[PDB]
Structure 1
Amino acid sequence: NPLFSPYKMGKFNLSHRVVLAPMTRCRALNNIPQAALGEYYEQRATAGGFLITEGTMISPTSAGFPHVPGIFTKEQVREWKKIVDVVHAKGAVIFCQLWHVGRASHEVYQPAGAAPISSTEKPISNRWRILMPDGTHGIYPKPRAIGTYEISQVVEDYRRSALNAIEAGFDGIEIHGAHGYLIDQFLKDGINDRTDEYGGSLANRCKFITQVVQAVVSAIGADRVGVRVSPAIDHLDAMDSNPLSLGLAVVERLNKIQLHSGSKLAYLHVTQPRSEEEEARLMRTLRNAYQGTFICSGGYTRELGIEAVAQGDADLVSYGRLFISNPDLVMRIKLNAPLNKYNRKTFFTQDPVVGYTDYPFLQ
């Protein structure tokens, strides 16, 4: 089973290739990591296994879900340290995903009820609805298009949050540049209509992600930085006219950051949408173009994960939904044991136990 061959992710020695994908679960009440998160990640941690946290706020304006953790205050850093310690006690490696939602927010999630920020004033269309704190669904509002000074402040928010993650003991961070959130709102020409130096050309649309990655690399070192993108996922009205070219442009800029820094990033992490042959070709083209470690995600199974590693399509495979309901997913994949079903109704509820830590281990 090639999923259980070791892998050197830079300075981290992984014992197997099964990764916990980042998943928002909304149990971090008031944006403060809670003890329940420690139990949840501890259940899924394995010796030499790699975990990526739920998306984590970089600033008071970065959220678009209820009760998601932040890492921009010292109180948040203190509580994260307790969780990181219990994960490290099991021998796992853990990265904190840094997440700004941009226009994918609502007045209820913003300080003083202000408008969310974005590359443009275009809202997500009414085809999509936002989960509200009371469990109903609301309307995405028109965002405020930020100028270049404010862009530089957001870059600094990523940098400070990366330093805070290291202070909490995280092994590294992942930049969430996928799924139609803030970075993707600059990348995708279906959203970014700017006429300044951050819009127009493919090069200009890639400027923001380049500056973010450069800032965190300078702060904590390239080998502690992963980058997640999704050029071919259209979530929240985030489409590009040429997804493969957009993806290769991002890959080119990551390759150049590495040469400039004299070090490789921890990895490139790409979601696929789920013809199948074309979509796999898109993924393999990005993998082949990138000088480093490649993590694939999106609809993977035991069989598909084994085939991805064996055929050289990916170095690591991340699993989301099956890790929700199978705390021992790594062991079950190793043994080819039957998997437990997941309950979508409790993906984003606030209960510290129900649908969170009460999925059973293998019987």
Structure 2
Amino acid sequence: NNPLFSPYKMGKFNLSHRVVLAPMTRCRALNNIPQAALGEYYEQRATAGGFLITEGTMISPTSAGFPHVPGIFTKEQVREWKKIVDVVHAKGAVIFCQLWHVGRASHEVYQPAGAAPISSTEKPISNRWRILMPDGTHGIYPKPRAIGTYEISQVVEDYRRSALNAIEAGFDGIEIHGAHGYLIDQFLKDGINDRTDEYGGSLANRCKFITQVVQAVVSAIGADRVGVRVSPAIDHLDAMDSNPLSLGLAVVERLNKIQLHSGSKLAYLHVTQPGDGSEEEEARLMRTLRNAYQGTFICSGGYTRELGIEAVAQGDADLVSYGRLFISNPDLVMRIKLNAPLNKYNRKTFYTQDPVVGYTDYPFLQ
């Protein structure tokens, strides 16, 4: 009866249901190397024909702003990801790697040689926000270095090489992290991008970086293995746009044009929202971006079982991603299918390093 359990064709991938694991940073990938613990964690959540998105994954030595997040820029990282991808595929699941650059949302402790983080801008995140340090304290975001356009093209190549590494590890595809005030969003949002060259100012200029990143990974691995995540109206790390709907529609137009020029559709567009009870206004934004995009749409942010069912039933979205409920409900798909009670999550262990505690020790349904 439940449309969340109707099958869906995501490009080449035949999904058996519409419940998606949203990407979440958990900081168990010690020294940026995927660990056996990650394999247990993703395997617990994998289902036959279900779609998983990994935690954000570094594309370069300078792309991190969290401790013990995995990378996919070295061959050592590729070898260890392969072991995780294999156990997920042994469950019949489809898995994409999220490619993540934090831009100015970093700190000397996270950068090679303690160098400054990079951004569209030379302005620091304001002291309204604090960065989680490796010792569990909260530190001050430093002044970033505004990069020139050659360096922009080098970052684009980091995305491209990371996408090829993800394919080498056996991932089904990659997702571009263009959300939450990180590097791509620092170019998109006119509340951050103060550039006066061809990457700042107009909507077209502000959309150049995400267009070039998506085009590069499309050319390398094929559009149907590329998803794109954005958040036009999440206020995180001083990310704000004067006209969020207009910015979101401008991004969607770029994606439609990339598809037209390459003769193929992307895997999906993934839009995430605050989702913390603004409900009607947020729902209208989500539906407006979905209606403008020629392809598969994943909605994200505060969805419940009931709101996910409604989203698919009403044609508002094709797939529904869940984040926090998947932390504490490894069998979330099954609980949603059965309408079984959901278990709470322990916020304290979202970002700790233990390979079991708060990570793989949340039980299945009895």
Bin the TM-score by the shorter chain.
Answer: over 0.9
How far 1:55 sits from its partner (Å)? 0.1
Say which of 292, 307, 332 aligns to 2:335. Answer: 332
Give identity over the alignment, percent: 100
Say which of 289, 292, 295 aligns to 1:289. Answer: 292
Q: Which runs of 5+ in 2 are unaligned?
A: none
Q: How far apart in 1 are the matches of 2:244 and 2:315? A: 22
Q: How far apart in 2 are the matches of 1:315 and 1:272? A: 16
Q: How far apart in 2 are the matches of 1:116 and 1:75? A: 24
How far 1:234 sits from its partner (Å)? 1.1
Q: How far apart in 1 are the matches of 2:272 and 2:259? A: 22
Q: How far apart in 2 are the matches of 1:241 and 1:122? A: 18
Q: How far apart in 1 are the matches of 2:124 and 2:18? A: 38
Q: Which runs of 5+ in 1 are unaligned?
A: none
How far 1:98 sits from its partner (Å)? 0.1
Q: How far apart in 1 are the matches of 2:179 and 2:325? A: 21
Q: How far apart in 2 are the matches of 1:19 and 1:305? A: 11
Partner deviation per Cα, 1:252-296 (whole Å, 9 max, x = no partner) = 0000000000000000000011x2111110110000000000000
Secondary structure of 2:227 counterpart: strand
Say which of 299, 303, 307 aligns to 1:300. Answer: 303
Aligned length: 362
Superposition misfits of 4+ residues, deviation over 3 angstroms: none
Secondary structure of 1:37 counterpart: helix
Partner deviation per Cα, 1:124-173 (whole Å, 9 max, x = no partner) = 11011000000000000010000001000000000000000000000000
1:319 has 2:322 as partner: yes
Alignment RMSD (CA, Å): 0.4
Q: How far apart in 1 are the matches of 2:203 and 2:307? A: 33
Partner deviation per Cα, 1:17-42 (whole Å, 9 max, x = no partner) = 00000000000000000000000000
How far 1:342 sits from its partner (Å)? 0.1
Q: How far apart in 2 are the matches of 1:33 and 1:103? A: 24
Q: Where do 1:168-187 residues align within 5 Å?
A: 168-187=169-188
Q: How far apart in 2 are the matches of 1:281 and 1:317? A: 16
Partner deviation per Cα, 1:216-270 (whole Å, 9 max, x = no partner) = 0000000000000000101110000000000000000000000000000000000
How far 1:345 sits from its partner (Å)? 0.1
Q: How far apart in 1 are the matches of 2:201 and 2:293? A: 24
How far 1:109 sits from its partner (Å)? 0.2
1:152 has 2:156 as partner: no
Secondary structure of 2:177 counterpart: strand
Q: How far apart in 1 are the matches of 2:304 and 2:351? A: 23
Secondary structure of 2:246 counterpart: helix
1:360 has 2:363 as partner: yes
Q: How far apart in 2 are the matches of 1:308 and 1:109? A: 39
How far 1:100 sits from its partner (Å)? 0.1
Q: How far apart in 2 are the matches of 1:215 and 1:292? A: 19
Partner deviation per Cα, 1:47-74 (whole Å, 9 max, x = no partner) = 0000000000000000000000000000
Q: How far apart in 2 are the matches of 1:233 and 1:348? A: 21
Equivalent residue, structure 2, for 1:231: 232
Secondary structure of 2:321 counterpart: strand
Partner deviation per Cα, 1:184-219 (whole Å, 9 max, x = no partner) = 000000000101110011100000000000000000
Secondary structure of 1:96 counterpart: strand
Q: How far apart in 1 are the matches of 2:201 and 2:342? A: 47
Secondary structure of 2:43 counterpart: helix
Secondary structure of 1:63 counterpart: coil
How far 1:112 sits from its partner (Å)? 0.3
Q: Where do 1:170-319 residues align within 5 Å?
A: 170-273=171-274, 275-319=278-322
Secondary structure of 1:236 counterpart: coil
Secondary structure of 1:226 counterpart: strand
TM-score under structure 1 length normalisation: 0.99
Q: How far apart in 1 are the matches of 2:282 and 2:166? A: 34
TM-score under structure 2 length normalisation: 0.99
Partner deviation per Cα, 1:304-357 (whole Å, 9 max, x = no partner) = 100110111100000000000000000000000001000000000000000000
Q: Where do 1:37-52 residues align within 5 Å?
A: 37-52=38-53
